[PDB]
């Protein structure tokens, strides 16, 4: 099903899956991470795109988060890939910084962003607790994870993504 296929992107506005472009809205804008030498100790922070900022989360006791600063982020903006250490080790399942990547056919990997020198800024994106504060949707594409904006994000708003139902229960949501 196009719904479940890695090769396809999805247009929020149209509900269309496509390979290159939505026929109505054109190709999606992927925002690049900033350049940082591989393995840099502050790699995850320094990889942050211009216009955003890592600062304490607005969620109580949630540590750091990612805020939008420069200007309105439109719907359908794409971020990623989520970087980290790829592994099947199940202690990665518990870092709290891992996304499951489905390789299809009851087999999977983890991309673990726990190590800041290996991860990118997306490790700092916190979990939405309600659909009203969620402005990012995580999804798998080309065997990797990306976040796309599912509403307009104004300056001064925290970016917030949904972690999946299992981790959400763990967070008390």
């Amino acid at each position: 099903a196009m719904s479940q296929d890695d090769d396809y992107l999805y247009c929020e506005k149209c509900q269309n899956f496509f390979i290159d472009s939505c026929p109505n809205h054109g190709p999606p804008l992927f925002v690049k991470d900033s350049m940082v030498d591989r393995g840099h100790p502050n790699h995850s922070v320094l990889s942050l795109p211009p216009g955003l900022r890592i600062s304490p989360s607005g969620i109580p006791e949630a540590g750091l988060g990612v805020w939008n600063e420069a200007s309105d982020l439109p719907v359908g903006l794409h971020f990623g890939p989520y970087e980290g250490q790829i592994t099947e080790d199940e202690e990665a399942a518990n870092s709290g910084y891992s996304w499951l990547i489905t390789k299809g056919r009851n087999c999977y990997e983890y991309v673990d962003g726990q190590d800041e020198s290996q991860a990118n800024w997306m490790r700092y994106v916190n979990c939405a607790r309600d659909d009203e504060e969620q402005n990012l949707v995580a999804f798998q594409y080309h065997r990797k994870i990306f976040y796309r904006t599912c509403r307009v994000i104004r300056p001064g708003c925290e970016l917030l993504v949904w972690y999946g139902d299992e981790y959400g229960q763990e967070l008390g949501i």
């Binding site: 399942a93 518990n94 870092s95 709290g96 891992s98 996304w99 499951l100 489905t102 983890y110 995580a138 999804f139 798998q140 994870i145 972690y163 999946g164 139902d165 299992e166 981790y167 229960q169 763990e170």
Partner: peptide, 7 residues
């Protein structure tokens, strides 16, 4: 169980 998962 702190594993982020897609739909």
């Amino acid at each position: 169980a702190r594993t982020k998962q897609t739909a």
